[PDB]
Amino acid sequence: SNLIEVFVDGQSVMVEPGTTVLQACEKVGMQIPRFCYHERLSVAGNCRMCLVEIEKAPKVVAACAMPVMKGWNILTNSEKTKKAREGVMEFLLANHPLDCPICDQGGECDLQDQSMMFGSDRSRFLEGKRAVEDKNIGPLVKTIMTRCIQCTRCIRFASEIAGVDDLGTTGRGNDMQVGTYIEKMFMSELSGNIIDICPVGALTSKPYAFTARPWETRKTESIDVMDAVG
């Protein structure tokens, strides 16, 4: 009656039909590391981080957008799964600038945490390191577009929640500038909610910009005002 058998490294569990490998892996506790997938949006696949060696397959496949046939076994802690994670994490940090002091996501990065816990240590790629000059999106949202890892999360957020359709990919190859083409100061509702979407330090708060770095500040429960929803 609508169940699917998978083995997470031997531990059997049941999967509803149509869902992903990733929701079942998060059901058993294993957080497969992700960059483009986010549960409030649709499923892109453009970050490639969620590769996992699924058995009897020479090719290692994504986990955010895989249909779940009956009777899997999912090897998360294998050899070439770790090798693919090392490779992808080495690819991300190539054209990313040395801005971790002047970033605003020092305590709250994603490249930093996942490159400690999953990446390599000795870097490579001696020369190169192109840079994309920033834009002026809005006076409420400070924007540096060199740190953009082109992950296509703000674009999906715009076209699927905001409905404004002002952010887009421009170019090919390495050169993909993400933003608005026409020098237009992007101003709409929920434009303050894009600084929490952007997983790397490429879209930060403008009025907050350089007052603290989030290990000093303590976090406290409270209830919203000014809206009747809270």
Partner 1 sequence: KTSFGSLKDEDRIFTNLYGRHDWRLKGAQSRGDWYKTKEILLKGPDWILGEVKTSGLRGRGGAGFPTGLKWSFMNKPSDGRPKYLVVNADEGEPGTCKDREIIRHDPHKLVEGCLVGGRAMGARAAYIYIRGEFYNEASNLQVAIREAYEAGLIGKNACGSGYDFDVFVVRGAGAYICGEETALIESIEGKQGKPRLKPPFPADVGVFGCPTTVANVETVAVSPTICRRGGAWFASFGRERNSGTKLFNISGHVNNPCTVEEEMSVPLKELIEKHAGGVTGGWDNLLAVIPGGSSTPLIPKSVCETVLMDFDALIQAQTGLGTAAVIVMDRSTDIVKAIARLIEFYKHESCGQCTPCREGVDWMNKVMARFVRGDARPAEIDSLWEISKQIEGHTICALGDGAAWPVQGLIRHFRPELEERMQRFAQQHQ
Partner 2 sequence: ALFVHRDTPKNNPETPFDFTPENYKRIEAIVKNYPEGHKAAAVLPVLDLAQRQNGWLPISAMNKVAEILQVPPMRVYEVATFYTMYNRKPVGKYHIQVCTTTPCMLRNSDSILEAIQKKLGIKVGETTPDKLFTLIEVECLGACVNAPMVQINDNYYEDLTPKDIEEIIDELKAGKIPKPGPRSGRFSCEPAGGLTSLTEPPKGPGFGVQAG
Partner 3 sequence: PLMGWASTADPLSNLVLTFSTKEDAIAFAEKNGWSYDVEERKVPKPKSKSYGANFSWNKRTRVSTK
Which of the residues 151 through 210 are near partner 3 (CB under 8 A)? 152, 155-156, 159-160, 165, 168
What's the rounded Cα separation, in Å, for the pair 174 and 129?
Answer: 11
What's the rounded Cα separation, in Å, for the pair 83 and 96?
Answer: 21
DSSP character for 71? Answer: S
Instruction: Please report whether residue 171 would count as binding partner 2 according to CB under 8 A.
Output: yes
CB of 114 to partner 3, least distance (A): 19
Partners of 142 in beta bridges: 204
How many CB atoms within 10 Å of residue 166?
Answer: 18
Instruction: Please report whether residue 124 would count as binding partner 1 according to CB under 8 A.
Output: yes
Which of the residues 6 through 65 are near partner 3 (CB under 8 A)? 16, 18-20, 23, 27, 39, 42-45, 65
Residue (51 or 162) nearer to partner 1, CB: 51
Crossing angle of helices 79-92 and 111-118, rounded to 10°: 140
One character per residue 176-195, x = contact with partner 2 (rule: CB under 8 A): -x--xxxx------------
C-alpha to C-alpha distances, 155 to 36, 134, 166, nearest whole angstrom = 11, 17, 8
Residue (20 or 119) nearer to ligand SF4, CB: 119
Of 85, 148, 166, 200, which lies in the binding site for partner 2, with binding defined by CB under 8 A?
Answer: 166
